[PDB]
Symmetry: C2
Subunit: 294 residues, 2 copies
């Protein structure tokens, strides 16, 4: 219906394409037949997760088998580890915007060559919540920055303020997929996707602190009153790009606290451990349910 | 003589400070007795390049042993990975400025509590090389943004313009050691730190492209005329994170490319590896050339 468009012409005018960071080249693996069937991309923080989820989303549809399976397919940078289970492309992506833009840049063409039409790209990860007790899966509406507006900025030799819608109907299908289970609170809200974990995020335990709590309260509570329900680092970008690759994006991010009470956490180890496994638990069944019905 | 200064008041009024990305904490591992030695931090992107260096500095000073040493010292995230050999603290950072600031902020907490005075901090990586034959190890002067301005901008809930100079004493001592290793090009200059690998850099093979060749080399040629000799995406935050909290900064990068004449490279696979090892060979050289000199 619609296929992975890349607004790049000069790819046409190239004998051969190499994707440095994953370890992939063209005129070696055949993109059409290798990668053309994958209807869901899905990325996460650390190949300590997306490896697991590439085993779980293999468990749900039944691509599961007793042998040593789903061996990591991408390399070059040990930063990017990949798998391929069925139509699913489970791909970790490091920390923060620039890490996640490469993966998303070289996954776009990685599909375009494959010719992918139907591929949903969803970010699983973690975050901190504003106004949202621990364990709630704040799906993303837009990608705000530091001025509570739905725009990430992309210097290109110069400017480029790119929008960051998350993909309504898709979000509706994730929402309809954690309301089709009921075991965890699954609400929606805008995200402050930030570039500095310590100062950007309000926090009071970095190494360059020129504000207090009375003034981190203001911001956070201005994040809340402005639309923002969830704090992380990769997602504005991750909605600028996919909205301008004709690729439906979404972010699925357990909040690991409500920073209206603090800056470090309270529940013991076992509590964080289910929370942490809920974005995939809802992303993997959300997925099986698009593989059942397709 | 010169300790590691943390610019945070609330760090004193704190019971136990955890480091969420190193899994470290300060109420298990005695920082002083463990981490008081270190007088250099060395970093890069992948784990298989920093492990190669950490098992490399240990045979270059004469503390190596034949059993399974150099075992990873920080988990929680698999993204980051570090080993401590002698007075060296090697740690991978991954990609972007966002990742590298997370390693830097808790490290400089970890090194402050340790009472470490002397801890130079060094980066070692890859970069496209404006106006430099493939392989010249550009040693960074200043880390400028998209308008050639030696300032890095920080989000601080809406706030601070930090600078980005590399420590001039260690720069000399890292150019003063590879004409002590005279078998590899060793130039100095400025560098641009771009939050996005295609359009920030300005490359004709991504997905979201608005500019031609003619408009590509207009930008690189005017960055050359400024002092930019190479392009990677971690250094402006690395340069400024160091200057602030007092750290002596250096960025020692090989170039793979000359972007005035391409966006993809030309020489063999065996030609890049030896180029890919020109950061460490200078670094461990300049490390030992102090380790002996103390």
């Amino acid at each position: 219906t619609a296929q992975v468009h890349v607004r790049n012409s000069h790819i046409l005018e190239m004998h051969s394409d190499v994707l440095f960071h994953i370890g992939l080249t063209c005129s070696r693996q055949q993109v059409a037949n290798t990668f053309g069937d994958v209807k869901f991309f899905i990325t996460g923080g650390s190949a300590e997760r997306m490896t697991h989820f590439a085993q779980s989303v293999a468990k749900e549809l039944g691509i599961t088998t007793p042998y040593g399976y789903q061996l990591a397919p991408i390399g070059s940078t040990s930063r990017y580890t990949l798998f391929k289970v069925g139509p699913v492309l489970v791909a970790n992506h490091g920390i923060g915007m620039p890490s996640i833009s490469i993966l998303l840049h070289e996954v776009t063409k990685l599909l375009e060559y494959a010719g992918a039409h139907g591929a949903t790209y969803i970010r699983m990860g973690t975050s901190g919540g504003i106004g949202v007790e621990p364990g709630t899966v704040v799906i993303t509406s837009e990608g705000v920055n530091n001025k509570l507006e739905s725009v990430d900025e992309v210097a290109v030799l110069g400017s480029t303020v790119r929008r960051p819608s998350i993909c309504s109907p898709e979000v509706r299908e994730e929402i309809i997929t954690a309301a089709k289970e009921v075991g965890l609170p699954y609400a929606v809200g805008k995200t402050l996707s930030c570039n500095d974990f310590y100062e950007g995020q309000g926090r009071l335990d970095g190494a360059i602190c020129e504000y207090t709590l009375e003034d981190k309260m203001a911001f956070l509570q201005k994040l809340a009153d402005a639309g923002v329900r969830n704090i992380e680092m990769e997602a504005r970008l991750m909605a600028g790009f996919c909205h301008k690759l004709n690729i439906p994006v979404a972010v699925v991010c357990v909040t690991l606290l409500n920073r209206l009470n603090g800056d470090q956490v309270l529940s013991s180890h076992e509590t964080l451990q289910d929370f942490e496994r809920r974005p995939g638990a809802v992303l993997l069944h959300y997925i099986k349910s698009k593989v059942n019905a397709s």
